[PDB]
Design a protein around this nucleic acid. Structure first.
Ligand SMILES: [Zn+2]
Ligand SMILES: [Zn+2]
Lengths: 97, 96, 145, 209, 114, 104, 48, 147, 265
DNA sequence: CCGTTGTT
DNA sequence: CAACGGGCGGAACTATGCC
RNA sequence: GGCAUAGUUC
């Protein structure tokens, strides 16, 4: 995904416009569930990976199951899925959030 | 004294005008910065500019320090009369 | 031929169908010699650039040489072109005596001054073309009433 | 100059090699990538009174799906190609049993020759390319997104999937530069693949009409 | 260069070729008046044309009340101190802002440019 | 400019036709002379007369700079590089004059 | 006047009054303008 | 100019222009030229004197007025294209005086520089502390006030 | 600077100093005393002359050569002219032209006039003036990816001309055929197709909108560009483009042509 | 100012 | 290359002359 | 009743 991003965005511009504000959602989750950042957590990184993979299937823009429709949906949600994976990376979840 | 050398891509008139306008813009901006940094913590212009309500630092500069250069069609004021701006100036006067 | 000629001077007289070369009008006024026409136009003959500028205008005088034929050429292009020739020539003389530069004069003997004023117009045009005087601006308030 | 003429011939040859590679014909890597010195050595570094005389540079190549379907790339030596030159080329194609051919022109072709090229369209297919139009590859320009020619099976599947009649697709003229580069006739559909700022990729379709 | 006129009809003299003596003749189209010229050059065209205005500057500009005056540039001829000055004051002068000077002493009219 | 240009070209061609000596009789090339390619017709209206004419200039330039072999190499390199006679002359002149400035 | 009749169809495609496709997905992604925000990708710029 | 100032042969309305560089003298008796009065500066001193000022300030019961000021050759009418051959001074007692020499050949002087404003813009107080669009807007809104 | 010279149009008037037409039948006894030595060394024909003088500053600024000028003249006029030229050694650079109804003086004035306004010594036609300045923006600079994966911005000279001829500039040697671009939409169309014209139109609209610092969502830009370039040819938003659409007459009648459209239908 | 149609 | 024809902001409020 | 012209507000 990093290589795909570097092809899509030469001249290195990170700023982009996408529908869900993942960082603010994470901040809201932390404050809602009274997460203490100084303690070890109970989140399994495999659970993180599986949850992201299952979530990406429910964000459907092009509905279908033909190869043409699947290609259309992948093209329609490529950038947002790249952003989603980058944010919900397991190491970032374990260290930062 | 013809000692001015033209800048590449520009005419002699163009380079002279560029230097003059640059000097005057530097003067106006420096006086504006002085006027800004000499304000007070109770000043109402600062109150209405810092909070973003209405006004700007250029307006404060024009009120306090210097109104600045006046331009017509992007150039300095032209020679309406024969080689002079007004009947109160000598001919061929390029001063500020 | 156009590339060698360069610039030519023409005059748009009122109540005439299209343009006329200036030497034709000067001849129609009654001046035949190029020396006399250049006396009326170029005041100081020690100006070779002005002389060269006016030379292509005089090269249109290779054909026309007399007042009668010049008047015929001028009057050929009236508001209603005539079926005869004497009426056309009379119309040409009438236009050059009544509608060209009325402020100089309208009497019978006004040609000697109309020629000088037309020469002044041509001279000022040459000065403008040579870059010796600034072109006028319509927004100057000395040029308004 | 001789150096400039060699350079122009080499650039035209390289662009035509790239064109044939894109059109699916079988051009090898060494033919695709020739240095200027290699071309000078192989076919004359002196054009004027030299071995390369806008002839012997003609290219015959066979399509990757059918060695029987082959294409010519002819180099007329005349600044204005004429009716008799077109007839000579068509005779050579007929005798070699070749259907399609390209023709790179020095300056231009007379309208009579162009119409005599159009007339034999079902019998033979010939295209005119100017010398200036091939010094560069328009496909490599960054403003030009990738184009893919779609088969009739892929068109039919696309139309059925979206329930579209061919009137309802965007169009592209048969005189388009890229359309001429790919050699596309009316009724074929091209596919455009380009990156997007809001999605990351976007596939469009154009109908040649 | 200049224009020369016939003495009979007073018309412009065009150049005509004498294909016998290999000589240049100026002849008019009205009469048969011939001449031999000394310039030997039909046409001259200079495209630089950076004419020095000292030929075209009149000495009468010294009476202009609207012109600046200086006393640090004495006249070369009569040694008069005060001297009016101005720029090219003409179009087709590129962009040169060189100054020009005219002596203000009556009947001197010295017009130089340092 | 096209219509005026075409008319100018046609005019130029017609004036040139009208300014010909009426029969363009195609005289043959000139035979030799130590020079290389002396049978060449490669430059229109250049001659073996001109080749010999230039040889003098090379020999005298070399002789004062200080041989007929080096003269023929200078000539032949110039003869290959050349395509028009006035240019062939121009090259010969330029070498002799500027090398004279180094012989000085 | 140029774009007065361009609409989003229930097919999710963008078509004019003659049902000619303009975009297969509106805005090339299919989302509405008033619901998107500025964000940073955070994996493009960092070195290896 | 002497004849026009004496008001003997040439009316005060006539304008005379000398184009020094181009050697032309132009005299206009036309109707429609627009002109404004200016004071006359002879060497460096105004021709207007305290005697004129006193005779003016005794204007009642003295039949001395603007016409008698004009007839004395003190003021003059200058139209637009005669203003191109004149050197003006904005204020007498400030620009005629000895300074670092800018111009020592003044030919006229302004009566008061605030007479460049029209009827509706002569009611704005401190117009030189304002912004030009604001002065224009007030010139517009002065014709709508109710009195 | 070499490419700057290659890409800027220049006729003979840009470099000539002065010209004149003489009458000199004698090859040896030349009216002008300056050319004597080399004209004698050089030496049917016509007795008239066309002597021109080339300005040294402009001659040496463009890195031009008198041999190059002579060969260009030969290419332009063929061998029906004669040309003899001095060299830069002398302070006066001289070119002398002679011909190898139809009178000589009027023909020489047409030769001079054509040779001064039609010669095209160098450059590309219709390209008037070409600038050359370092970029100062991150979109006009070349940005690469190093071997360690970062983005590094490089400053390289970029040119900015006046007048457009895109194909020749692209075909020029030592010119990048990928990033070179113009701002004439019709030229981009006729050179690169319809997709390129769409992308370029979007970039031009983005530039004009964002010059003011303002922001407009990309969807609206994309929609306008797709609407303009949907049918394969450029569709100006005028009566022409609006009525070119195969829509109903009632939509066209309400826009810049009512009665004419209704009566045609 | 610039899209049609004529004339050449 | 020349001539011809259509196209040119949005609302709102007073008054006066004339058919 | 309608046509035209002028002025003014945003
Ligand atoms: Zn005579
Ligand atoms: Zn003196």
């Amino acid at each position: 995904d990093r290589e795909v991003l570097r092809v899509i965005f030469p001249t290195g511009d990170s700023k982009v416009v996408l529908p869900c504000n993942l960082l603010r959602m994470i901040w809201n989750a932390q404050k809602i569930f009274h997460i203490n950042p100084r303690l070890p957590s109970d989140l399994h990184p495999i659970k993180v990976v599986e949850g992201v993979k299952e979530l990406s299937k429910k964000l459907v823009i092009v509905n279908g199951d033909d190869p043409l429709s699947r290609q259309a949906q992948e093209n329609a949600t490529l950038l947002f899925n790249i952003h989603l994976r980058s944010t919900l990376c397991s190491r970032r979840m374990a260290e930062e959030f | 004294n013809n000692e001015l050398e033209p800048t590449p891509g520009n005419t002699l008139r163009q380079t002279f005008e560029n230097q003059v306008n640059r000097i005057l813009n530097d003067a106006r901006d420096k006086t504006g910065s002085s006027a800004q940094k000499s304000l007070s913590e109770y000043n109402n212009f600062k109150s209405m500019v810092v909070s973003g309500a209405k006004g700007s630092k250029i307006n404060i500069s024009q009120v306090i320090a210097v109104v600045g250069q006046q331009n017509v069609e992007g150039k300095r004021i032209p020679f309406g009369f024969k080689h002079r701006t007004l009947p109160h100036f000598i001919k061929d006067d390029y001063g500020p | 031929k156009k590339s060698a000629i360069g610039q030519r001077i023409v005059a748009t007289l009122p109540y005439i169908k299209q343009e006329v070369p200036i030497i034709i009008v000067f001849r129609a006024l009654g001046f035949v010699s190029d020396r006399d026409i250049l006396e009326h136009i170029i005041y100081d003959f020690e100006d070779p650039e002005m002389m060269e500028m006016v030379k292509p205008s005089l090269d249109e005088a290779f054909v026309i040489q007399e007042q009668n034929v010049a008047l015929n050429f001028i009057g050929s292009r009236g508001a209603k072109p005539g079926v005869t020739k004497e009426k056309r020539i009379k119309y040409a003389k009438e236009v050059l005596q009544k509608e060209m530069l009325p402020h100089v004069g309208v009497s019978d003997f006004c040609e000697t001054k109309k020629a000088y004023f037309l020469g002044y117009m041509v001279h000022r045009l040459l000065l403008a073309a040579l870059g010796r005087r600034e072109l006028d601006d319509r927004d100057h308030y000395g040029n308004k009433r | 100059d001789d150096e400039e003429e060699t350079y122009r011939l080499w650039k035209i040859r390289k662009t035509i090699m790239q064109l044939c590679h894109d059109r699916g014909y079988l051009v090898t890597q060494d033919g695709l990538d020739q240095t200027l010195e290699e071309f000078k050595a192989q076919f004359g570094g002196k054009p004027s009174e030299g071995r390369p005389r806008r002839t012997d540079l003609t290219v015959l190549v066979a399509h990757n799906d059918d060695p029987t379907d082959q294409m010519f790339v002819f180099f007329p030596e005349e600044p204005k190609v004429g009716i008799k030159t077109i007839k000579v080329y068509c005779q050579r194609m007929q005798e070699e049993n070749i259907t399609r051919a390209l023709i790179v022109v020095q300056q231009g072709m007379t309208p009579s020759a162009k119409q005599s090229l159009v007339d034999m369209a079902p019998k033979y297919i010939l295209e005119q390319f100017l010398q200036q139009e091939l010094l560069i590859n328009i496909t490599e320009h960054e403003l030009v997104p990738e184009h893919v020619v779609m088969t009739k099976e892929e068109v039919t599947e696309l139309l059925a999937r979206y329930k579209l009649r061919e009137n309802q697709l965007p169009r592209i003229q048969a005189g388009d530069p890229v359309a001429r580069y790919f050699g596309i006739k009316r009724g074929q559909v091209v596919k455009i693949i380009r990156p997007s700022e809001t999605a990351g990729r976007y596939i469009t379709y154009r109908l040649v009409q | 260069v200049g224009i020369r006129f016939c003495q009979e009809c007073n018309n412009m003299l065009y150049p005509k070729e004498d294909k016998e003596n290999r000589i240049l003749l100026y002849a008019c189209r009205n009469c048969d008046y011939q001449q031999e010229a000394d310039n030997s050059c039909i046409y001259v065209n200079k495209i630089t044309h950076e004419v020095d205005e000292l030929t075209q500057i009149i000495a009468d500009v010294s009476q202009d009340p609207t012109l600046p005056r200086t006393e640090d540039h004495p006249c070369q001829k009569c040694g008069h101190k005060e001297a009016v000055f101005f720029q090219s004051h003409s179009a087709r002068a590129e962009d040169a802002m060189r100054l020009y000077y005219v002596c203000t002493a009556p009947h001197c009219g010295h017009r130089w440019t340092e | 400019d096209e219509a005026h240009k075409e008319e100018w070209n046609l005019f130029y061609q017609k004036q040139m036709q009208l300014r010909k000596g009426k029969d363009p009789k195609i005289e043959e090339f000139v035979p030799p002379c130590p020079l290389k390619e002396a049978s060449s017709r490669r430059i229109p209206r250049l001659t073996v007369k001109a080749r010999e004419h230039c040889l003098r200039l090379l020999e005298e330039a070399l002789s004062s700079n200080r041989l007929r072999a080096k003269a023929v190499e200078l000539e032949h390199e110039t003869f290959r590089n050349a395509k028009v006679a006035n240019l062939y002359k121009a090259s010969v002149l330029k070498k002799v004059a500027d090398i004279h400035r180094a012989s000085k | 006047k140029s774009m007065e009749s361009v609409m989003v169809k229930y097919d999710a495609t963008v078509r004019n009054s003659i049902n000619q496709v303009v975009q297969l997905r509106y805005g090339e992604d299919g989302l509405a303008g008033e619901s998107v925000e500025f964000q940073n990708l955070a994996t493009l710029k960092p070195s290896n | 100019r002497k004849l026009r100032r004496q008001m003997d042969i040439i009316v005060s309305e006539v304008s005379m222009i000398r184009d020094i560089r181009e050697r032309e003298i132009r005299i206009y008796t036309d109707a429609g030229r627009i002109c404004r009065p200016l004071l006359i500066v002879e060497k460096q001193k105004l021709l207007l004197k305290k005697r004129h000022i006193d005779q003016l300030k005794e204007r009642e019961y003295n039949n001395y007025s603007w016409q008698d000021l004009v007839a004395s050759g003190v003021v003059e009418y200058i139209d637009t294209l005669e203003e191109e051959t004149v050197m003006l001074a904005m204020t007498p007692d400030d620009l005629q005086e000895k300074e670092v020499a800018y111009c020592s050949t003044y030919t006229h002087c302004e009566i008061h520089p605030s007479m460049i404003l029209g009827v509706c813009a002569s009611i704005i107080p401190f117009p030189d502390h304002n912004q030009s669009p604001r002065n224009t807007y007030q010139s517009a809104m002065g014709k709508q006030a109710m009195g | 600077k070499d490419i700057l010279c290659r890409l800027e149009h220049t006729t003979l008037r840009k470099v000539t100093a002065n010209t004149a037409i003489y009458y000199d039948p004698n090859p040896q006894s030349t009216v002008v005393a300056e050319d004597q030595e080399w004209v004698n060394v050089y030496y049917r024909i016509s007795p008239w002359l066309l002597r021109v003088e080339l300005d040294r500053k402009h001659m040496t600024d463009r890195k031009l050569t008198m041999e190059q000028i002579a060969e260009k003249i030969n290419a332009g006029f063929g061998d029906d002219l004669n040309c003899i030229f001095n060299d830069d050694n002398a302070e006066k650079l001289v070119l002398r032209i002679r011909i190898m109804k139809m009178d000589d003086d009027v023909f020489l004035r047409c030769i001079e006039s054509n040779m001064l306004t039609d010669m095209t010594l160098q450059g590309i036609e219709q390209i008037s003036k070409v600038y050359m300045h370092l970029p100062q923006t991150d979109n006009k600079k070349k940005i690469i990816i190093t071997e360690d994966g970062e983005f590094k911005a490089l400053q390289e000279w970029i040119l900015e001309t006046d007048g457009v001829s895109l194909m020749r500039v692209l075909s020029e040697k030592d010119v990048d055929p990928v990033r070179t671009t113009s701002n004439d939409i019709v030229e981009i169309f006729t050179v690169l197709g319809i997709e390129a014209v769409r992308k370029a139109l979007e970039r031009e609209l983005y530039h004009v909108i964002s010059f003011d610092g303002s922001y407009v969502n990309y969807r609206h830009l994309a929609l306008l560009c797709d609407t303009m370039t949907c049918r394969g040819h450029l569709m100006a938003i005028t009566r022409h483009g609006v009525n070119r659409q195969d829509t109903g007459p009632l939509m066209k009648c309400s826009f810049e042509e009512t009665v004419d459209v209704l009566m045609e239908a």
